[PDB]
Assembly symmetry: C2
Homo-oligomer: 122 residues x 2
């Protein structure tokens, strides 16, 4: 696994990367909320949202946070990756949708099962 950061909106948003394949954003308060073994075949980006984990920043409302996530997708040239949500991430869902990013709640369910359900044979 690997850590890195993107300078965006005057902040340095820290995140973890791992895997190769179509890109998928994993969004919770921070990378630590995704402990499960992730599946092969996808380029995962685990964001630490501003104000949590390793990303220094102020505490912002859900809609402001959603712009940081939409901002991340375009600045990293990920196009329109799917966004899995957990914890504080859940509250971003509606806002992400309005920004053109499909949001998939993954609270209490492993990433491997989510990507399979919403993709695998059906």
């Amino acid at each position: 696994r690997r850590a890195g950061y993107l300078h965006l909106y005057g902040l340095n948003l820290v995140f973890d990367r791992v895997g190769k394949g179509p890109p998928v954003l994993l969004v919770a308060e921070e990378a630590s909320r995704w402990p499960e073994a992730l599946p092969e075949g996808y380029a995962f980006y685990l964001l630490d949202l501003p104000g949590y984990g390793r990303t220094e920043g102020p505490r912002m409302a859900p809609e402001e946070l959603a712009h940081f996530v939409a901002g991340f997708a375009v600045m990293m040239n990920l196009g329109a990756p799917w966004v899995l949500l957990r914890g504080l991430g859940l509250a971003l869902g509606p806002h992400l949708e309005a920004l053109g990013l499909r949001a998939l709640p993954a609270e209490g369910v492993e990433v491997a099962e989510v990507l399979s359900s919403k993709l695998s044979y059906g």
Copy 2:
């Protein structure tokens, strides 16, 4: 006015730039639709939308084009710049606002009057 380019969403969006200060996006089909003399104090970015002028691209819907504009702003680290509209650009207004950018119609007015009026009156 210095010409430039930004690779975005697979395309090379050409734009003209002039001025220093708060950033301001002038969006119409392309740059030459802003003949007026622009006021000092703003960093103006005049876009040639995909498919028009110097920007090679397919004909896209207004909601799709609003995405390019938003993409341009975060990509160029412009924060939340106001977007003045003219011609084709006017159709983008609603979608732009929904993406978090304030759109101002500049159909009949020269940019300087639009900005001084919006900033000073009301």
